[PDB]
Design a protein around this nucleic acid. Structure first.
Ligand SMILES: [Zn+2]
Ligand SMILES: [Zn+2]
Lengths: 921, 70, 184, 184
RNA sequence: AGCUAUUAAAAUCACAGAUU
RNA sequence: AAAAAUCUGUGAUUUUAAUAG
């Protein structure tokens, strides 16, 4: 005992406190192991190491590993060649005697408690319970004091903004690790060692150790492999902002020592390339600073991922449209000549003409809506109410907008009290009202883009998820359609800014002939047209106090965007019996078919849903771009490679990053999404399936393959890991095999950002499929928003249907020999919809009879409900409609002496008319 | 009681908004603060207190005229 | 016009009961069939105007009602509020309105970050005693704290030797300034 | 065309035989003629409605086409005024100067107004930030010197520079909007 | 020998509800 | 000055289809 403890102490140190004595200590640590019998990224228990604490240093553990003498000597040969570099911890080699055997020992000096893998794993598998590893690492590294954790919500990004400040202090750890990785790989090539380097070999300090599986070779021409080292760490280095030290401009715009000409620079191509060769030297694959040089769709995702990581070092004022001098009718101008994207880089127009005269409507229309001329000819602006960058203000000055309350319907309310509603028994009461807003409702709601942050995907895993999510959309068809064949439902709607100052969308759709619409559309396939959205406040009944804004995209964006997508979008609503439900009705038994189809085929079923906190604001840029790439993948014959790129840029330039006009000031939007896009309800759906699949892939990799017995799952895990981190091309044979495995055990029902899942319960408990504890993990490092467990639900039995879908509860009833589901709403919504109205003339019901019809159609399902109070909700609406019709008929008789016949309209206060709408076939 | 209070204050902002209190933000941020909080309140005792604070402000704008509620 | 067809219908349908020659009956029935066809056209043309008349009357009745309501919204809404405040059983609303009906009414009310500020006009000593109790103002169902008092062009009352000396001697009205003790 | 006259002539002959008791051998021929004349009249009359409804279709289309021309000519002439209204505001002397400094003659759009414009609007939230921006009454932004010319509070009323001191700052209606101008 | 009536469907226009 | 979509209700005009005279 003591004799062995003597030598481990070393020949030049002392003060080692034994944590477990001469016996090894059992501990749980994360590993990234690929082997003939296992391929996992989880954590394993290890027994071979004795750990000792050094008392003098802040955090220094003497760890000694004992193994067969041959293995100890093998490491010594490897260490002796590598030791002269600056990335290897001090090793000491010796052997010790036992009563009947000899065994070797390898002693490491001053190794920190946790490897780099534990930091990465602890952040990519996160839940507010059993989080002691992440909490521990913060304290020892020195990011925050222990008093910080006293706050019960310290971990919530959208409620504790200071958290992003704490993580940034870990940025030095991550950045320091990489610069020591490139130094180590260089030693490998020179000294001639072949091996695979991974995170679990590295301390938090940056030193490498535990290289027992490396093999020797001739000096020089060594081979290091680092696909899994960088890939697994990618979300962390973007979440922790590790490249802050590389900021190009280190002066404040408001400082008196600033210079003017510094703002002009826009071309940072050389700067980005220098970083790549500095940190990712041995990454292997090519990297094109400007995505216009890429070859495939997979390369555009690959390069655009790096650009999002390197965009943190570029000034915020360098992005946006690039404008140029121009001549119109002989007088000068400033007009768009390109664009500078955070993701895609710099793109130049292929068509710009510097001299124009006798403008046609097409030239006149795109000149007027292009921000270049209006932004340049107005004063500057500094708005301290919002974090978003903003420089412009109308010559007329700024203004403000308020929101007025609703109008109270006295006659209907008195009717409810007479019937017995709203009694002090507290059965039902009003919950939806018309809320007012202060003068700054718009800008202070645009400020919520603060939550948008530059997330970075681990590209080695987003390749496979991009393949699987695409398989869900292979049923539908798509292509380009001529302007003669488009369909528009509402011509009486705003055309955006500044075109709305002259007329609504109908005026422009008839002033532009078909040939001029196709001329403009063909022009957009080779040029970029920036446009402005306008923030307008929604005025409708709500149950929550916060105001909600919706942007109206300029006409030239939607007029061209839907002509490019209309054929694909209309196919999603015509296909029936698929994952996307956007086109299915809830009447005529549609609700029963939707649920009965979802539940069919899943063994041992369970039911769950989930919620995205602030989806519109926190949606990452990278995953919104991919949603535009998947929906455009159908254009295979009608467009060449370059035509699809310039149609992708036009979507990013007009929707993702925009010049937003609100209350007389133009602001530069940082990202996210806007509800006014032509692909809103369908671009959300693709993102929704991206998170659901990405949660499956993330967890399936982490299950200990050494104890799995479902051979089909065991083989899938090994093929999945091999296809991600150890292959250059995805074999589509596996994807069809894995996609056919989700459809049997993880069936889905998706509709925009609202969806339901029916999943095999036995597999989820073991971890072969996603689970609510897995959706917390994927959102934290892919959306950096915390998904509180109280906002989602689980229903362990299918007889009750989903708890809540599309804001409507579900009930199951038995009738004759058949049993079916029925949706019914929240009762307070139907009653409150009549008491409070948004227009004064609606206070008198007799003017609008048809408002309570078509509102009792939604209330019929309540008639089947158990609670007698809920039953009254439907029958009161029938009496109310009866009261109105008999009042109008007698009123017309007295006033004009003509009697209306009641027989034709007597079907509206009998439940037989309403029941026909929830009858199958 | 409670549902009468939640409806007797929707008409108050209707009277105040018609009287053009929206011109100056300081007095419109005071009313909208009460209007929003009174609607969400569940305790009838507290909801009454806010209504009286809003009602007292309304009288200050010289809008009493003839009263039948002696 | 329709009476002609009915007279022919009654006679010719009854003719079946007598021994009229079949060949004449065939012609007689043919004429009756034509008359019935004409009657149907009269019914369709007449009633198509009748249903149009009903629609026009109902449409204009709704329009007349709608335009009538919008012409008196502001005055009507004030009555709506004061009719609603009666339905409440609380006595607090009665106290405020009773004071307002009296000679004591509030001046401008100032929101503030620290505490709201009140200004109250007290025309007579009785009005001052109404709201002032224990050295504090009891208005709007809350305790309001007095800071300073203002005379008719003066502040001499500030010493608060006011209960009897000032009522007989000095002029009125008397104005108070207060702040809310509890912040909402 | 003359079918109606032919039918009327046949009708006259038909009654001019029946009313006096003409032999049936002639009446039968006339009755056949009436069927021919009436049926021919009806078929020709069927064209009248087709022509009439095509005439109204033509009238609706012509008016619709004519109205569309007026609307199109109105908007384009309105956009010329807007487009040439903005051309009058450009300070192209200042803008062109920076375009020479740019290496390739191109500059970001989000930087032109902040570098070349002559007026700046600053919205301040708290006096803690006001005194951070203002120094001796001048503001520096984008490495350029601006001086304060005008101030307006949230309500839209004018505020004096001497009125923004600490004690009176609490009374003001923040946010406070400053209007600045450059000195060259 | 082609003309009149009642239902069903499609299209256009107008208004009104619910959902993300 | 009040957005992108899906579903449903009422009314008016036109056409088509079926049955009856
Ligand atoms: Zn590339
Ligand atoms: Zn295409």
């Amino acid at each position: 005992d003591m004799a062995y403890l003597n030598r481990v102490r070393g020949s030049s140190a002392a003060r080692l406190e034994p944590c477990n004595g001469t016996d090894t200590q059992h501990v749980y640590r994360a590993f990234d192991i690929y082997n003939k019998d296992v391929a996992c990224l989880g954590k394993f228990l290890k027994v071979n190491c004795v750990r000792l604490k050094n008392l003098d240093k802040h955090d220094a553990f003497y760890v000694v590993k004992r193994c067969t003498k041959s293995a100890m000597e093998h490491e010594q040969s490897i260490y002796s060649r590598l030791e002269k570099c600056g990335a290897v911890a001090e090793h000491d080699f010796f052997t010790w005697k036992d009563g009947r055997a000899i065994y070797g020992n390898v002693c490491r000096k001053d190794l920190t408690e946790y490897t780099m893998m534990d930091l990465c794993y602890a952040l990519r598998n996160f839940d507010e319970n059993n989080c002691d590893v992440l909490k521990s690492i913060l304290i020892k590294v020195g990011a925050c004091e222990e008093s910080y954790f006293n706050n019960k919500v310290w971990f919530d990004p959208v409620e504790n903004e200071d958290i992003h400040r704490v993580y940034a202090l870990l940025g030095t750890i991550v950045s320091r690790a990489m610069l020591k990785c490139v130094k180590f790989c260089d030693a490998m090539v020179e000294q001639g060692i072949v091996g695979v380097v991974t995170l679990d070999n590295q301390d938090l300090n940056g030193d490498f150790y535990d290289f027992g599986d490396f093999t020797c070779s001739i000096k020089g021409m060594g081979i290091p492999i680092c696909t899994s080292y960088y890939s697994y760490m990618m979300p962390v280095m973007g979440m922790t902002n590790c490249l802050a030290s590389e900021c190009f401009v280190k002066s404040d715009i408001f400082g008196e020592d600033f210079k003017s000409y510094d703002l002009l620079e826009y071309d940072f191509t050389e700067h980005k390339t220098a970083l790549f060769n500095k940190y990712f030297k041995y990454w292997g694959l090519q990297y094109h600073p400007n995505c216009v040089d890429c070859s495939d769709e997979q390369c555009i995702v690959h390069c655009a991922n790096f650009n999002t990581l390197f965009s943190t070092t570029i000034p915020i004022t360098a992005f946006g449209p690039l404008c140029r001098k121009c001549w119109i009718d002989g007088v000068p101008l400033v007009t768009t000549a390109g664009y500078h994207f955070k993701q895609l880089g710099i793109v130049w127009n292929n068509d710009l003409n510097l001299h124009s005269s006798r403008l046609s409507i097409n030239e006149l229309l795109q000149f007027c809506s292009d921000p270049a001329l209006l932004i340049a000819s107005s004063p500057a602006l500094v708005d301290q109410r919002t974090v978003c960058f903003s420089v412009a203000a109308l010559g007329t000055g700024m203004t403000n907008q308020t929101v007025k309350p609703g109008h109270f319907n006295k006659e209907f309310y008195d009717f409810l009290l007479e019937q017995g509603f709203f009694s002090e028994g507290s059965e039902l009461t009003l919950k939806h009202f018309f809320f007012a807003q202060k003068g700054d409702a718009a800008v202070k709601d645009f400020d919520y883009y603060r939550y948008n942050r530059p997330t970075v995907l681990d590209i080695c895993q987003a390749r496979v998820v991009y393949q699987i999510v695409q398989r869900y959309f292979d049923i539908y068809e798509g292509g380009c359609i001529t302007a003669k064949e488009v369909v528009v439902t509402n011509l009486n709607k705003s055309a955006g800014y500044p075109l709305n100052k002259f007329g609504k969308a109908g005026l422009y759709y008839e002033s532009l002939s078909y040939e001029e619409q196709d001329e403009l559309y063909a022009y957009t396939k080779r040029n970029i047209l920036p446009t402005m959205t306008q923030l307008n406040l929604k005025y409708a009944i709500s149950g929550k106090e916060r105001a909600r804004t919706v942007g109206g995209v300029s006409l030239l964006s939607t007029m061209t965007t839907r002509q490019y997508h209309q054929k694909h979008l209309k196919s999603i609503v015509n296909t029936r019996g698929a994952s996307v439900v956007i086109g299915t009705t809830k009447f005529y038994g549609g609700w029963d078919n939707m649920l009965k189809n979802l539940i069919d085929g899943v063994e041992n079923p369970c039911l769950m849903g989930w919620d995205y906190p602030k989806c519109d604001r926190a949606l990452p840029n990278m995953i919104r771009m991919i949603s535009a790439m998947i929906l455009g993948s159908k254009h295979t014959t009608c467009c060449s490679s370059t035509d699809r790129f310039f149609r992708l840029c036009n979507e990013l330039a007009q929707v993702l990053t925009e010049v937003v006009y609100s209350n007389g000031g133009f602001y530069l939007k940082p990202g996210g999404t806007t509800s006014g896009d032509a692909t809103t309800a369908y671009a959300n759906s693709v993102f929704n399936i991206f998170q659901a699949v990405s949660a499956n892939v993330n967890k399936l990799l982490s299950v200990d393959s050494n104890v799995c017995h479902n051979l089909e799952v065991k083989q899938l895990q090994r093929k999945l890991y091999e296809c991600c981190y150890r292959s250059t091309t995805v074999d589509d044979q596996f994807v069809v095999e894995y996609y056919g495995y989700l459809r049997k055990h993880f069936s889905m029902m998706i509709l925009s950002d609202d969806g339901v899942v029916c999943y095999n319960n036995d597999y989820a408990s073991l971890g072969y499929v996603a689970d609510l504890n897995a959706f917390k993990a994927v959102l934290y490092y892919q959306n950096n928003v915390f998904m509180s467990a109280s906002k989602c639900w689980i229903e362990p039995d299918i007889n009750k249907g989903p708890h809540e879908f599309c804001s409507q509860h579900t009930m199951q009833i038995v009738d004759k020999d058949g049993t079916y589901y029925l949706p019914y709403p929240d009762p307070s919504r139907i009653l409150s919809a009549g008491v409070f109205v948004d227009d004064v003339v609606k206070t008198d019901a007799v003017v609008l009879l048809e408002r309570y019809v078509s509102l009792a159609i939604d209330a019929y399902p309540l008639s089947k409900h158990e609670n007698p109070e809920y039953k009254k909700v439907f029958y009161v609406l029938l009496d109310w409609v009866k009261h109105l019709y008999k009042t109008l008929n007698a009123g017309v008789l007295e006033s004009f002496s003509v009697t209306l016949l009641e027989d034709s309209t007597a079907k509206f206060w009998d439940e037989s008319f309403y029941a026909n709408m929830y009858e199958k076939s | 009681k409670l549902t009468d209070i939640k409806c007797s204050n929707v008409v108050l902002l209707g009277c105040l908004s018609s009287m053009n209190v929206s011109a100056n933000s300081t007095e419109w941020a005071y009313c909208v603060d009460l209007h929003n909080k009174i609607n969400l309140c569940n305790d009838p005792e507290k909801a009454q207190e806010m209504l009286l604070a809003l009602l007292a402000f309304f009288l200050s704008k010289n809008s009493a005229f003839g009263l039948d509620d002696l | 016009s329709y009476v002609i067809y009915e007279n022919a219908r009654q006679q010719y349908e009854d003719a079946v009961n007598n021994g009229s020659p079949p060949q004449l009956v065939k012609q007689l029935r043919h004429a009756m069939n034509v008359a019935k066809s004409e009657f149907d056209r009269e019914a369709s043309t007449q009633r198509k105007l009748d249903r149009m008349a009903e629609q026009a009357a109902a449409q204009m009745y709704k329009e007349a009602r709608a335009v009538n309501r919008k012409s008196k919204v502001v005055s009507a809404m004030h009555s709506l509020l004061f009719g609603m405040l009666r339905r409440l059983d609380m006595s607090s609303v009665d106290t405020i309105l009773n004071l307002a009906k009296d000679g004591v009414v509030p001046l401008s009310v100032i929101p503030a970050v620290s505490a709201t500020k009140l200004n109250i006009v007290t025309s007579d000593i009785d009005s001052y005693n109404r709201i002032q109790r224990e050295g504090c103002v009891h208005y709007a169902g809350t305790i309001w704290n007095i800071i300073d008092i203002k005379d008719n062009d003066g502040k001499v009352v500030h010493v608060k030797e006011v209960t009897a000396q000032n009522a007989e001697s000095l002029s009125w009205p008397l104005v108070l300034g207060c702040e809310r003790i509890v912040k909402l």
